[PDB]
Homo-oligomer: 412 residues x 3
Amino acid sequence: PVLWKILWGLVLGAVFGLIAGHFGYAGAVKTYIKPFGDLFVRLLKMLVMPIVLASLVVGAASISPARLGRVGVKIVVYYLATSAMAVFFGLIVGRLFNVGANVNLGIEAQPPSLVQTLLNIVPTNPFASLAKGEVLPVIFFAIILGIAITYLMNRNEERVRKSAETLLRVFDGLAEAMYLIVGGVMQYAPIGVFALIAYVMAEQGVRVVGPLAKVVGAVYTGLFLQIVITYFILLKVFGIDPIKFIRKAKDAMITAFVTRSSSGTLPVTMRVAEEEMGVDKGIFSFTLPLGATINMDGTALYQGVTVLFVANAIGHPLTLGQQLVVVLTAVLASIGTAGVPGAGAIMLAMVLQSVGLDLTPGSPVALAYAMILGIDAILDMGRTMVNVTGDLAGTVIVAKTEKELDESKWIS
Amino acid sequence: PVLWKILWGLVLGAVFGLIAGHFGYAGAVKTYIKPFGDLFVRLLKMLVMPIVLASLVVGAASISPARLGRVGVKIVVYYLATSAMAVFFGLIVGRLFNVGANVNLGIEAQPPSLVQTLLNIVPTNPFASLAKGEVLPVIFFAIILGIAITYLMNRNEERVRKSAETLLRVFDGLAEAMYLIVGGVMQYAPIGVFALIAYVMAEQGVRVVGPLAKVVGAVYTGLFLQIVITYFILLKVFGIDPIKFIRKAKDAMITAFVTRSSSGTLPVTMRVAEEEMGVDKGIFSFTLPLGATINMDGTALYQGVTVLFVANAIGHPLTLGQQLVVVLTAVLASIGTAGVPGAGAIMLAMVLQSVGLDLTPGSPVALAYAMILGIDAILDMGRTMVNVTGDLAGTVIVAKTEKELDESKWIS
Amino acid sequence: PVLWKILWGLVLGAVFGLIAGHFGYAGAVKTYIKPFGDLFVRLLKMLVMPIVLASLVVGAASISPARLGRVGVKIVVYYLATSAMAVFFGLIVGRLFNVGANVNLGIEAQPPSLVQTLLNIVPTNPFASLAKGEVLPVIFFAIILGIAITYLMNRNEERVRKSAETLLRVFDGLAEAMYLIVGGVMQYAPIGVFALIAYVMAEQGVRVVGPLAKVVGAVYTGLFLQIVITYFILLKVFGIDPIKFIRKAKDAMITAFVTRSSSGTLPVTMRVAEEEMGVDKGIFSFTLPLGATINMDGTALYQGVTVLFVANAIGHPLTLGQQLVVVLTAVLASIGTAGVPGAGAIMLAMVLQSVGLDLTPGSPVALAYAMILGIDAILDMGRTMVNVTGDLAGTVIVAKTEKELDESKWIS
């Protein structure tokens, strides 16, 4: 029927892509197939700022300031727990696979800018932040507007109440229109998913062999553990069926895989949280856009594995604690950056630079980095998918502890 | 009375401009007169994005998706027909006038980027497209919002209906305010039109003599034919009186002439389509902003004539078919570019470059190009005016075939 | 209680700052204290465009076009009167203090661009002006929208009336939400004020000694006169108690002092004009944002004193008339620039350049300029505070002459 059509799009696309690439034809795919996926991506991007704004004004109106504060602190604690596990599994699986058994030849400290990152949460011109697509300051402004609106709707004067209600309905109507449009785009999603996975498989799939296959294997094993261990256990502890959860998350998960953007998947993730998970807008309109920018699980996994791979390729000895400190400094440097393709590759290059390594052409390290860079898309797909999964899990969890989860949705 | 005041502004301005230029005083005109016209232009530009957005959300709400699809395909077929005629008349009149009987001395292929032009129709951030004034993605977003809004207003739940109605009324109120403001600016239009035509006549009017006069004559003859043949015949075939049509179009036509921008005339063109032509908002809020960016009649005319002029000035033999292929490649390269001053001059320079010509200082071709460049404003006025005329004709025509034209407006 | 808490924040901050700087610790202040003030500044900046837009649409709706015209002309006449006095006091106090009795060693004319400044009042894309935070074109668009809205709400057709009312309520709700939020931020203001004055005192306070102290003394004396003479007399003549006025202005005045931005203080200035002064929105939503950008009192004072200081430091003879012409050309060059930190320092550098002086490293003039530059923050605080004071005075005055001032607010 319509349901699961996306999982067919993905599976069918990946096979076609592999075959096309193996036979030389990845160029034709780039020309003919890929535009359909680019279209899918654009259609979803179009929706990010309107749906995030309107949903959070409405959601933050629907809920008390207090409850919003608890949601903020609960979801941040969740992302700390889950990133700690992601660091663990990055270190473990990287070493189990022993990434980097090939042979090559074989000092920078910068101040912490988090004070300014926090200050930068506050927009100086909210129209500018909407036009530039900066999510976190829009979150801030939407929240304050929602709060203000509900304070005014309880005020005595009818003019203020009627004005506030009109404003809130304008945002409610926009949100509704966006959710409807998301549904329509998701009628198209299978074609887009096919086209995207096809292009990726044809270009970089053929390259996963030998050592790099163990890197890919290693990375994907880490994600797997993060899901079936960290997310499942957390869900069961709080009384959510993790298999039901996964079934409901599937459209968001596959979209995350192919689009390689947490923010670009947001309209889908939010529709899944509303229609499938049964989370109230007061929760997910806040937790989900926030988690799209602060979730550090995929980064911890990527850095743990690729840092080990690089160190071993150049024969540089790396202790588990030294790997841990390096991964942690990369994670701290990464916070606040939303999900974007080719991100972690850049961050890895930075991490290597900051520890005092020669990236000049011809160097061993430049070589190992280029090797990662060439499978980076394959790694990014997995990175984004595990992050969006963790976002849905944490949203659902927080919603449950707040009694904002509709239970009828969870029972066969 | 007030009506026809604009045609007096134009006529009076052009005479004053010619006289001032002939007597040396074009500098004083630039200083003292021109700012009033720049003001006219800015006041109209101010209105483009609000009126286009609100009118298309409302219009697309007022109408079924199906009807909107038919309007899309009908108006595109119209622009293909009319550009084919414009190519014809460009070739014909250019050769009849034998442009370029003066004597001078006397290889680049680039891939087609239309796939990406189409993809670029979809905005990735609609707030950004509003802030940057990109019309076609705003068209896309407005249409989808209108559709979504009407789907929601038929939904059962009263909260959704009331929210959707509030949102639609906000857009309706904005549109109404814009149309009212347009009316006010058009109280000022005669002064602006005077100032603009005055400046243009004083600076470049004095230069239309000898060979360049035949170029101007040639270009203006082509436009004339395009109107009295292509537009009139199309109007009569579908049962619109072309003389009544022209009478109603006059304010939009003159504004197009002086402002040299299809988009910058839009608030006027839309008010003319509503008040005078009697076209429903469901049609013109879509056809007119679209036609302002895809209409290729003025370009076909300009390229046909100026390409012939250049080829003859340098004594390069040019067959009718070779001229046709060149003009066609310029038109294909031009699609999607909205009406902007100094556009076609740039495109001509590109066309010359792409065929393998030396534009370096002192070269014959650099010389012929500079000669066109110096009358380019005079040519742009006509180019924009014929495009806006064709836009109104096609809007009216499409509206008639859809039974969206109010007939009481058409009968003395 | 809560009231006057800001004046404690200021006083306490300035003492802590001076002590910290005198003992070496200004670096720790920059690190630990200053971010709280930067936060204060950002929170206020966030509100400028929403509150200015919504208040002026509503205000301009509430009032007739005629009354708005009178408000425009009355407030401009006020700023001319008060800048003339500011020029006077700049010249007087500069010479009384005899700034520049230290000893050093010891031709550019550019056309007037005011025509284009005026043209630039009209936005070509109002969404762009909102996103870029350009106040004056937003003023223009809001006014025209307000006018249009009220014309439509008197129209016969109920659809137009209901649409216009919905649009106006959306703006009214937004304004209300902003004013509520301002109130909340002002709960935080004492901490921000403390942090800001602390940082400024620790960095540049210790440097006010010797000659530069006489410059600071001189500048602050001029501001003082401008207040207790120009503003007080104007207030008494029109029957406003100037001591009551000052008491009501205090929160806006202190915020202006520490933030060093007329525009950045606007949400506070407008809340003070509404809650304290009792000015109708029809007046202050227009006069206050306008006065924030056209008020030239602080500039006249700064230029008069610093120009004299520079001339005397290099032993260049400067007659009172020559000083006057110089200050006047700086004021004309400054009009239209809103209040921004480090502005006048730049303008002084320009003024020196335009009169034909050598600013190359090592030069006497480069030296005197650097000396001013090092206390410039201390001078900017005072400049901004006197401007915002004059803005409130003129708003109140204009409101009184229009019978838009609520008198119950003015009686103990």
